[PDB]
Ligand binder design. Structure first.
Ligand SMILES: Nc1ncnc2c1ncn2[C@@H]1O[C@H](COP(=O)(O)OP(=O)(O)OP(=O)(O)O)[C@@H](O)[C@H]1O
Ligand SMILES: Nc1ncnc2c1ncn2[C@@H]1O[C@H](COP(=O)(O)OP(=O)(O)OP(=O)(O)O)[C@@H](O)[C@H]1O
Ligand SMILES: [Mg+2]
Ligand SMILES: [Mg+2]
Lengths: 47, 506, 464, 114
């Protein structure tokens, strides 16, 4: 019974950690896109 | 030799008309207008207005405010003679106006007292005064846990559909009792600024304020999602100017910016269209200034300047409740506290979804009335520890007597802070309600009925024992005699209260 | 002779002069705004020479209402601020105009806010610990008397409350002068600090130079130099010990970034000005203490989006003898002052300076907290119950150490109501030596929360 | 399989399969522990560690990285050794015996030295 409870808690924590890491990875994905575009258009504006 | 004189003569020589030479997606360049001021308001032939941002040697680059579709090359642009400014006055109460002060509610024109510039400096350090009197929001959670004082900047931050407008509309509605007093030192005037919100949501808000009798002291500055970036960029500033005209006259204003993340988006659009190199998340470096400039004018003026105040409830719409993003962090570092509304709590029926933990009020406490601070002093820590203990106990094999008592008290406190929309509570009713819970009088009531037991109980007090409410309202303190009378009334009511479970709540 | 305003781009104004009278860099120019409520004497600061006798300038007040062609007269000297003993006890803006007494300080000695840093031969390192009474600061991040201290932290983590706490702990009993420089913090906070210092009677010994957020970027970036010039006068001329509280120096860099965008300079990594390191060095190297005369400086550094890799904090990290990095994670657990014990550091946490006992206790605490951090990912999924029994014990005493680094700060009374407490350094070392050795790992964790000492620890333990 | 032969291809693909399964399991092992894996997966992990270490080799150009001289392993011997590993004939030897050896004879010598 304690293993059931502990593994349910572990699964819930893993799901919450997956959600947090997915939100993060989305933030760095958007930030990488932005930064790449900033570099590209900074080179463009100077040339 | 004579060239310098001759050239100088020319500069000297300068109802003057310029002509548009470029135009596109909000920005129009106007050659001529040698005597235009920076931030001057230029009127184009179709009644469209623009702000002269850049003043080059040659033409002037202006951000068009409104229908930029009607701006075309060769059109005549003529000065208004007024730096970026909007009409102000009491004629704006009960009206819906666009960021330029032009009415859009279909009623008549507004009789402005004067014109106020949108970019006047905020009160200096010596011109302000410590926030010392409360702005009752009518929300038990906010007025008990993170109280707002007049002159404070409180940030309503949360995700979509987390209940943020409501927490602002309820705050505006709760000022009707103060308005009916007729005392300028008590009346709180409201300016609800809608930036990029759906037109139907502005209509809803106006309907709610009308059915609550709140429009007779509220002004709505509407910049719906259909309007260009210029309107969504000015709307907070015109709202703050309407409010400032009252603030400097001794009146107390409540400004709601709904939502400042859309002003930031509009300013980002304008900046990128001006080809200004962006920074973090594509926002310009001025994006902080944009908001710091705006919320710094919400202040509690010193008694030398009439003692007026402007309270700001800026709204920020976080994405995936990421309170560490750029604009949210900027506004948190600008404002005096945040009411963080979580979508997790709000989806599970806890509405207002005030996350007690992250939510805080820096400037409050000094503003909270004595009775509320006495009854609600321990509420915040109790609720936070209850959330943590409920997270712990969800998987623990057993709960001690003290732990179970804490859990039972916290569940009833949460159910007590739960409150229906467009149903703000007077401060005395909130005092009694939080008294019911913090003093354990709810421990004998089943959780599911806490909302009803409370809701009915206040009615009884309004109907048969108003002396308690009158005392709390007048002396701003819950006296021990009134406390004993309230306890007696609570016990008397619990005898006749019919619980849903059937069991007596005595 | 005077010039003309040729281009206006927000708070940046281009002004053209006759070929023989182009002003030098950092000169102060005066223009006139004559429209209605915006009428003022606009103060510009020359930033670039664009050629053809044009000079690009940064406006100190908002340019709103300025017109092309208005006369601009150069003063021949840079923005000068009043300096002297009479400066103490008053509130100024970036331009030296007093706010409480509008005409005050017009006859004092005036000093340019632009000056070279002290020559390298005048600099010597400082290594004297400054006992604040905060457990975390005194143990893991010992502040340096005459050194440069910083309080990093995202939005709403307690930087300003720590600045107030260190004013209450250092400036309150300080024998010398103090200077507080708002550099883009709330005007409400400036007024609160003014009234608090007046109430504590510390105002008479401190000079305030605010230039807060509503100000344009020009003043928002020159206010730090103005306050630092007042402090430099108190240092070099009057021979006093000086406290220089700066709240917050990221707002100086941010104003610089805004100006750079307006000045036309190409953006750096993440939009900041290319001169970010140069400007920050110019500001910070002046805040150094010279050989025989000390200037203790404490600086709040806002970290945008809680990104401690942002170029501005990353640049300012190299200028500090002690750094206290406030963390959102520690804040969210209720552990005020919210210091990150692992990221914060000081240059004097060296056994030769703080002693072998202090160093040993600090390093053992850091080891325990680092091991706890390394286990954090497993603790997130499975909890302490899955760890080994040498790590389980370590994690328990790490949680107790983490909660014991918290303190009931004296500035936190306004929020909590609980009065503040001060822990002497020896008692802190003893308490943490005991905690790391496991002499308190049987008490509940909450017994260590916001307690401040061993006597209070025993008292609270009982209460629980 | 048409160029290197069916034996070489099979051994290479089995090694890659074992290593990919080990890479997938490394996340589990670091948190839930090896003891919670399946018996087959546990045996596979023990196989994969030895295979990773056996892919290491003391190259001649790296004498100044390790001190010991370089070694050359014929292709036939490599295929035979990895077929034995992937099939299990060396699960009894310690994994450190497979580190920087280069060949079956060196494997035996280093195992005896352990
Ligand atoms: N206290 C409450 N109790 C019950 N329902 C509520 C409460 N507050 C809000 N709601 C409902 O929740 C929904 C979302 O409310 P609201 O529009 O006020 O949130 P919001 O933050 O404005 O969302 P958005 O601005 O993203 O549209 C609405 O249907 C509203 O009626
Ligand atoms: N020691 C403390 N005890 C209790 N509450 C605290 C403490 N420190 C901070 N807080 C809470 O956190 C808030 C943050 O305070 P502070 O003004 O110092 O923030 P900050 O991180 O410096 O933010 P900003 O970016 O606006 O300068 C305080 O107003 C109070 O609400
Ligand atoms: Mg809404
Ligand atoms: Mg602060």
């Amino acid at each position: 019974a304690s293993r059931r409870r502990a593994m349910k808690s572990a699964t819930d924590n893993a799901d919450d950690l997956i959600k947090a890491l997915t939100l993060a990875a989305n933030r760095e994905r958007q930030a990488q896109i932005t930064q790449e575009i900033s570099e590209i258009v900074g080179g463009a504006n100077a040339l | 030799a004579d060239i310098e004189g001759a050239i100088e003569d020319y500069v000297s020589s300068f109802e003057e008309i310029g002509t548009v030479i470029d135009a596109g997606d909000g920005i129009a360049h106007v050659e001529g207008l040698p005597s235009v001021m920076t931030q001057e308001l230029l009127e184009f032939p179709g009644g469209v207005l623009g702000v002269a941002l850049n003043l080059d040697e040659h033409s002037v680059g202006a951000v068009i405010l409104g229908e930029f579709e009607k701006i075309e090359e060769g059109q005549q642009v003529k000065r208004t003679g007024e730096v970026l400014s909007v009409p102000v006055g009491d004629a704006f109460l009960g009206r819906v106006v666009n960021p330029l002060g032009q009415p859009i509610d279909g009623q008549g024109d507004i009789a402005a007292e004067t014109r106020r510039a949108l970019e006047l400096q905020a009160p200096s350090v010596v011109q302000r005064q410590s926030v010392s009197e409360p702005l009752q929001t009518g929300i038990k959670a906010i007025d008990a846990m993170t109280p707002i004082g007049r002159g404070q900047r409180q940030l309503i931050i949360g995700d979509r559909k987390t209940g943020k407008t409501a927490v602002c509309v309820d705050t505006i509605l709760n000022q009707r009792e103060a308005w009916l007093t007729g005392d300028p030192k008590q009346q709180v005037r409201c300016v609800y600024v809608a930036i990029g919100q759906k037109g139907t949501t502005i209509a809803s808000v106006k309907r709610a304020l009308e059915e609550g009798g709140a429009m007779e002291y509220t002004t709505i500055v509407a910049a719906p999602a259909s309007d260009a970036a210029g309107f969504k960029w000015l709307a907070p500033y015109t709202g703050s100017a309407i409010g400032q005209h009252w603030m400097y006259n001794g009146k107390h204003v409540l400004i709601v910016f709904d939502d400042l993340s859309k002003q930031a988006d509009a300013y980002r659009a304008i900046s990128l269209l001006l080809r200004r190199p962006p920074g973090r998340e594509a926002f310009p470096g001025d994006v902080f200034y944009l908001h710091s400039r705006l919320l710094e004018r919400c202040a509690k003026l010193s008694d030398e300047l009439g003692g007026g105040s402007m309270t700001g409830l800026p709204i920020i719409e976080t994405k995936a409740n990421d309170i560490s993003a750029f604009i949210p962090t900027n506004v948190i570092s600008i404002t005096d506290g945040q009411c963080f509304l979580e979508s997790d709590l709000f989806n599970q029926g806890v509405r207002p979804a005030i996350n007690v933990g992250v939510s805080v009020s820096r400037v409050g406490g000094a503003a909270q009335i004595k009775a509320m601070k006495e009854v609600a002093g321990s509420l915040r820590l109790d609720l936070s520890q209850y959330r943590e203990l409920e997270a712990f106990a969800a998987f623990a094999s057993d709960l001690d007597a003290a732990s179970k008592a804490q859990l039972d008290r916290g569940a009833r406190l949460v159910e007590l802070l739960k409150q229906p929309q467009y149903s703000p509570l007077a401060v005395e009713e909130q005092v009694v309600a939080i008294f019911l819970g913090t003093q354990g009088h709810l421990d004998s009531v089943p959780v599911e009925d806490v909302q009803r037991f409370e809701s009915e109980l206040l009615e009884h007090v309004k109907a048969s024992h108003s002396d308690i409410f009158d005392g709390i309202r007048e002396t701003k303190k819950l006296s021990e005699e009134a406390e004993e009378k309230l306890v007696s009334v609570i016990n008397e009511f619990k005898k006749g209260f019919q619980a849903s479970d059937g069991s007596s709540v005595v | 002779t005077a010039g003309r305003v040729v281009r206006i781009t927000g708070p940046v104004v281009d002004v053209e002069f006759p070929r023989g009278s182009v002003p030098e860099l950092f000169n102060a120019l005066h223009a006139e705004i004559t429209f209605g409520a915006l009428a003022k004497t606009l103060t510009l600061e020359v930033a670039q020479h664009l050629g053809d006798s044009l000079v690009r300038c940064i406006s100190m007040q908002p340019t709103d209402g300025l017109v092309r062609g208005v006369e601009v007269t150069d003063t021949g000297a840079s923005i000068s601020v009043p300096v002297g003993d009479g400066v103490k006890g008053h509130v100024f803006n970036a331009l030296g105009d007093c706010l409480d007494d509008p005409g005050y300080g017009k006859d004092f000695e005036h000093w340019s806010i632009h000056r070279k840093p002290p020559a390298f031969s005048d600099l010597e390192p400082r290594t004297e610990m400054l006992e604040t009474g905060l457990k975390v600061v005194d143990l893991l991040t010992p502040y340096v008397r005459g050194g440069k201290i910083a309080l990093f932290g995202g939005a709403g983590v307690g930087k300003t409350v720590l600045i107030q706490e260190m004013i209450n702990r250092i400036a309150r009993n300080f024998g010398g002068t103090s200077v507080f420089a708002g550099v883009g913090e709330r005007t409400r906070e400036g007024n609160d600090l003014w009234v608090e210092l007046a109430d504590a009677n510390v105002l008479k010994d401190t000079a305030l130079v605010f230039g807060q957020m509503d100000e344009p970027p020009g003043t928002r970036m020159r206010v730090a130099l103005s306050a630092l010039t007042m402090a430099e006068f108190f240092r070099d001329e009057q021979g006093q010990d000086v406290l220089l509280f700066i709240d917050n120096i990221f707002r100086f860099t941010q104003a610089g970034s805004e100006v750079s965008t307006l000045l036309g300079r190409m953006p750096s990594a993440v939009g900041y000005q290319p001169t970010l390191a140069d400007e920050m060095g110019e500001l910070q190297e002046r805040i150094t203490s010279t050989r025989g005369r000390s200037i203790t400086s404490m600086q709040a550094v806002y970290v945008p989006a809680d990104d401690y890799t942002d170029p501005a904090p990353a640049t300012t990290f190299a200028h500090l003898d002690a750094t206290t990095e406030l963390s959102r994670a520690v804040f969210s657990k209720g552990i005020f002052p919210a210091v990150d014990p692992l990221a914060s550091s000081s240059t004097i946490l060296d056994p030769a300076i703080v002693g072998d006992e202090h160093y040993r206790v600090a390093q053992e605490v850091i080891r325990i907290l680092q091991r706890y951090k390394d286990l954090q990912d497993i603790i997130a999924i499975l909890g302490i119950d899955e760890l080994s029994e040498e790590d389980k014990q370590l994690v328990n005493r790490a949680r107790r150490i983490e909660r014991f680094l918290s303190q009931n700060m004296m500035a936190a009374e306004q929020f909590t109501g609980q009065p503040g407490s001060t822990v002497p350094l020896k008692e802190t070392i003893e308490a943490f030596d005991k905690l790391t050795k496991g002499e308190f790992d049987h008490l509940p964790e909450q017994a260590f929360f916001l307690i401040g000492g061993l006597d209070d620890l025993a008292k609270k333990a009982e209460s629980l």
